[PDB]
Amino acid sequence: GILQANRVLLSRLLPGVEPEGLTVRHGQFHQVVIASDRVVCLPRTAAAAARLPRRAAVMRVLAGLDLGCRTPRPLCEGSAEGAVELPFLVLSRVPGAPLEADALEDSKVAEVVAAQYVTLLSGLASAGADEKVRAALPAPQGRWRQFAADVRAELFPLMSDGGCRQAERELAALDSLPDITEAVVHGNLGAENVLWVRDDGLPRLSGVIDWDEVSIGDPAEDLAAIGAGYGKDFLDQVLTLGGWSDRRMATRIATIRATFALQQALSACRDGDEEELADGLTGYR
């Protein structure tokens, strides 16, 4: 296993910590070892290792943004960004737990949760128009067109005929999407990546984790994730509070939201997370 394989390095990074007591999250390029107060990114390949210098820069940039909440802060020295490759990257662990959809049935919880989503997304949006932000973050062109290709190549073989027909309709709409490169976009802003304080009172946003797919892009991508997780009414509340309820935006969200389970399945496929692949392919096989 990954803990066993990297036991020597982990003993140095986490002195006195028993390897078996730790946990692992699967990424496309990195395996993420989760300790009590910090996480250790271990590159799966040498190409993944060559990515880590850039990742350290990106996480430092995110750590400087005004989002109203925490992000995983790089615990390397600044010079690690100038390396050709790193054998690891350590980040601070964001405290808190996901919010279950249940909590939103209370309309005061819903308001306060929505407002904090708006602070986060407004900060990401404004940060998108900043050249030092734009310089450190990727900004792929025709990502939608290309995502559709990846789905047809990588996921259709795992689907039923009916599934492929369902997915085809969803993917086809994507070619209508404008290529928006305005905001910092998390790219995977499902409920498990948004952490709230385990404290008395109403939910308070602790921070956001798993920035693997972060880019300069379309804010509708993150709003789509929220809609997929929490449904139309909560989304509409976020859009209203944030000033984003125009029909152009609403339409892009709709289009992207219909692909969001496929985005999850594509991720699970590439990082070998079996259960999340099964979840993602629910109703496509």
Ligand X SMILES: Nc1ncnc2c1ncn2[C@@H]1O[C@H](COP(=O)(O)OP(=O)(O)OP(=O)(O)O)[C@@H](O)[C@H]1O
Nearer to ligand X, 212 or 218 (CB): 212
CB of 197 vs its own copies, minimal distance in Å: 5
- Site pattern 28..57 for its own copies (x: CB under 8 A): -------xxxx-------------------
Query: Taking a C-beta distance cutoff of 8 angstroms, is the pair 151, 261 a contact?
Result: no
Q: How many residues bind its own copies (CB under 8 A)?
A: 43
Q: Does 29 bind ligand X (CB under 6 A)?
A: yes
Q: Does 70 bind its own copies (CB under 8 A)?
A: yes
Query: Taking a C-beta distance cutoff of 8 angstroms, is the pair 100, 110 a contact?
Result: no
Query: Taking CB within 5 to 8 Å according to partner kind, which of its own copies, ligand X, none is near residue 107?
Result: none
Q: Mention every residue, 6+ apart, whose C-beta is less than 8 A from residue 248.
A: none
Question: What residues from 52 to 91 belong to the interface with ligand X (CB under 6 A)?
Answer: 72, 91
- Site pattern 123..162 for its own copies (x: CB under 8 A): x--xx-----------------------------------
Nearer to ligand X, 59 or 148 (CB): 59
Stretch that binds ligand X, among 25-33, 130-138, 234-242, 255-263 (CB under 6 A): 25-33
Query: Taking CB within 5 to 8 Å according to partner kind, which of its own copies, ligand X, none is near residue 94?
Result: ligand X
Go through 249-282 and write b for each residue having 16 or more CB atoms within 10 A of its CB, e for each that does not: bbebbbbbbbbbbbbbbbbbbebebeebbeebbe
Query: Taking a C-beta distance cutoff of 8 angstroms, is the pair 99, 161 a contact?
Result: no
Nearer to its own copies, 119 or 255 (CB): 119
Stretch that binds its own copies, among 194-202, 230-238, 244-252, 265-273 (CB under 8 A): 194-202
CB of 38 vs ligand X, minimal distance in Å: 8
Nearer to its own copies, 64 or 178 (CB): 64
Q: Mention every residue, 6+ apart, whose C-beta is less than 8 A from residue 274.
A: 268
Binding interface with ligand X (CB under 6 A): 25-30, 32, 39, 72, 91, 93-94, 188, 209-210, 212-213
